[PDB]
Design a protein around this ligand. Structure first.
Ligand SMILES: NC(=O)c1ccc[n+]([C@@H]2O[C@H](COP(=O)([O-])OP(=O)(O)OC[C@H]3O[C@@H](n4cnc5c(N)ncnc54)[C@H](OP(=O)(O)O)[C@@H]3O)[C@@H](O)[C@H]2O)c1
Ligand SMILES: NC(=O)c1ccc[n+]([C@@H]2O[C@H](COP(=O)([O-])OP(=O)(O)OC[C@H]3O[C@@H](n4cnc5c(N)ncnc54)[C@H](OP(=O)(O)O)[C@@H]3O)[C@@H](O)[C@H]2O)c1
Ligand SMILES: CC(C)c1ccc(Nc2nc3cc(C(=O)O)ccc3n2[C@H]2C[C@@H](C)CC(C)(C)C2)cc1
Lengths: 406, 407
């Protein structure tokens, strides 16, 4: 008999990750787990053909069933429009889903003991959350073509005066609800992992903007979470950005870092490339309710490897991030459904994945972290299919051993 | 006889750095170099007393003489207003000088072989340039108190949002082409100076028409005024995405210039300086578009915590290297303009002595902590502020004496 997994929304993606996604389902998931599966094809051709409606349908399904697992997808640019003769330069499906669900995306590395990190002291990951654009947080910019007068007004006035040539201008807004969501999601994520949370900001050039974040986080923390935080021996703290990197540099990890800048970062984003390889980084979209999540690999579709696969050439694409999307999705599914057997399985597959790598069986990217790419020989790593087979083989052994303990 | 140094604008600063600035002049510079010195006191009390006019006078002097060397200064906030009973919350003098001169500030670490970095492969520094606010690049923000309609208009209307629910915050920002052209010019001039390649980083993501104007302006200026000179020195310019930029940094030896373009002014980014061990090892150089005018400065602040100890007669271990390298990089640029072989030699000698001293095991407590970890640092592992300056002064004398004795 298989494990009764329950309701899961799955989203198929593009290029190399799509290949790997099917191998994961065929070899690691479906042999052991029966799922009420709600499948949406977010591959670029089906998105074009549906006018991106499939992305919206998928997001609504996640809102309804609480658990999404998604494969990496192509975000179209001009070259992609010419390649697929697309109808429009469609918006990132990640953006569209995150917008509809209202969540915050949190990136978390998978640490293996034999893989170097930026800072060798890190034994647990530092989870980094971002405040991204949505329905209630957006910006327009435009080319100021010549001399004039830019103003920004509020109707129930704030000035430049352009007297010489041209330039550019912009505007940006943020509703309290958008910030409250970001706060809620971040506290929910902290309670889930049992780790402390830090909101980072900088400097206060836009003082009234950053102050609204600090205040909203503090208000929500004091009134709805502090009791639950102390209960788990954890805390919330606002922190400056420089003190945040300082702390990261000198810690073992195991905290959540909610980053607040004007749609990205230089040093938040630097920590997330400091765990060796892009194949070891997952995303989890966490909604304010605590109840709904969407799991996804943080990397892209791995186009370069896909082109090799199309020419029949050997690839060594790391499936770990994609596997951990399934395991973190299924783990959340199990917590909602109170399903002991599925929670066990999800954890088992995570253990097998790390054990396999720690035992010396790995894809080329991870071999390169250890040895340096110039020193990597073919004997040092497995190809995409060899590594998936090795995982599949170890997973079977692990679950067989579990069953043999009565 | 002393070295004829020429015209230099010097700016005195605040708290611990002011103490150190005088020690550097007394022990490392004035014994060996005669300077036509134009001195401005940008200490906070003299700024308050002149209604910040001294900062403006200093900036105009730099514009005139081409070389500024500045000590770290207090940037007032509310607490500083109460502490000194200031007349106004005066603007950062760095901002005021950078604005008047129109330059771009570039931060560069000083690497010593025995001091750990973030990435152990780094043997040369990665110089990071910032596009900061000025006369032609500025932003306002404000609290949207309730339901309404934010708009941004041009003498054409652009909706920022329709607020139909509760409150929020908004902002606006502008940028003139000239401000971007300056930033480009300064970055290419800086690259030619160091002989290293240049990378402009953006995140092509969010505000496409804004970032596109930067990319284009950099490319236009490069193609028309610099590419000939760049190829001449075996270097290049390249636009790059931000993630590919950190990737490259992670896996390189260093020795490139990274022009960063984000949506901040100049921050007090003490975060870059914890790549290279300690804040005492990070200098700033303000480079103007002309190539001709520079202002050198330590990247760190005034080191208030150490100053408070100094006021109570307690021993300090404050690292002077960044402050020393402000003088050496200033004097090096002075020497290049004046075509002064002797001053260029001296400037380089003092840099070598500084690194040699640290590499020989004599260092301030901050650097001892990089090596051993702060909990494991004993008093025998480091020198106090005055002990370390003496050691530098003593080694400098030896180095210049050896130079005199040789071919
Ligand atoms: N999750 C998403 O939906 C998502 C997010 C962002 C971008 N994208 C999209 O993905 C597409 C391709 O992106 P991209 O090529 O710029 O970045 P990418 O797909 O992440 O791949 C870039 C390079 O990173 C390395 N890499 C990434 N994942 C790997 C893995 N699992 N195993 C081994 N190596 C890995 C490879 O380096 P080597 O060449 O050294 O082997 C690869 O060529 C684009 O259309 C982009 O818009 C999708
Ligand atoms: N250069 C400038 O003109 C400039 C620019 C921006 C701001 N500031 C001003 O600097 C003032 C102080 O800023 P802050 O409170 O952030 O302090 P800071 O001067 O940045 O220094 C903070 C801490 O960093 C360490 N540190 C910095 N420089 C050091 C050196 N040369 N040697 C040894 N340790 C060093 C010390 O660490 P430990 O405490 O661990 O010993 C110190 O307590 C503020 O009023 C600020 O406005 C000046
Ligand atoms: C926690 C850990 C991962 C970490 C440690 C130090 C920093 N330091 C750091 N802060 C930076 C701010 C800007 C900016 O505001 O534009 C740019 C580059 C910055 N860096 C450095 C990033 C480094 C990978 C390379 C570098 C050349 C030393 C610059 C950041 C992260």
């Amino acid at each position: 008999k298989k494990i009764s997994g329950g309701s899961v929304v799955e989203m198929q993606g593009d290029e190399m990750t799509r290949i790997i996604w099917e191998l994961i389902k065929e070899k690691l998931i479906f042999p052991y787990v029966e799922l009420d599966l709600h499948s949406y094809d977010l591959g670029i051709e089906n998105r074009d053909a549906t006018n991106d409606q499939v992305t919206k349908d998928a997001a609504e399904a996640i809102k309804k069933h609480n658990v999404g697992v998604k494969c990496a997808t192509i975000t179209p640019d001009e070259k992609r429009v010419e390649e697929f003769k697309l109808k429009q330069m469609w918006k990132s499906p990640n953006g569209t889903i995150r917008n509809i669900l209202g969540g915050t995306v949190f990136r978390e590395a998978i640490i293996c003991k034999n893989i170097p990190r930026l800072v060798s002291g890190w034994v647990k990951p530092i989870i980094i959350g971002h405040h991204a654009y949505g329905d209630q947080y957006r910006a327009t910019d435009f080319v100021v073509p010549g001399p004039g007068k830019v103003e920004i007004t509020y109707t129930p006035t704030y000035l430049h005066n352009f007297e010489e040539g041209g330039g550019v201008a912009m505007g940006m807004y943020n509703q309290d609800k958008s910030i409250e969501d970001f706060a809620h999601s971040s506290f929910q994520m902290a309670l889930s992992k049992g780790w402390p949370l830090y909101l980072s900001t900088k400097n206060t050039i836009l003082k009234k903007y950053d102050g609204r974040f600090k205040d909203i986080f503090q208000e929500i923390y004091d009134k709805q979470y502090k009791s639950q935080f102390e209960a788990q021996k954890i805390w919330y703290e606002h922190r400056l950005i420089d003190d945040m990197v300082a702390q990261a540099m000198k810690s073992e990890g195991g905290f959540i870092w909610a980053c607040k800048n004007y749609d990205g970062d230089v040093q938040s984003d630097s920590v997330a490339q400091g765990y060796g390889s892009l194949g070891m980084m997952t995303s989890v979209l966490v909604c304010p309710d605590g109840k709904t999540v969407e799991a996804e690999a943080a990397h892209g579709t791995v186009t370069r490897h896909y082109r090799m696969y199309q020419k029949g050439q050997e690839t060594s694409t790391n499936p770990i991030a994609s596997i951990f999307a399934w395991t973190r999705g299924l783990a959340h599914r199990a917590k909602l459904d109170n399903n002991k057997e599925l929670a066990f399985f999800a954890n088992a597959l995570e253990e097998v994945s790390i054990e396999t790598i720690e035992a010396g069986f790995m894809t080329k990217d991870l071999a390169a972290c250890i040895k340096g790419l110039p020193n990597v020989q073919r004997s040092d790593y497995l190809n995409t299919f060899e590594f998936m087979d090795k995982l599949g083989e170890n997973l079977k052994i692990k679950l067989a051993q579990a069953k043999l303990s009565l």
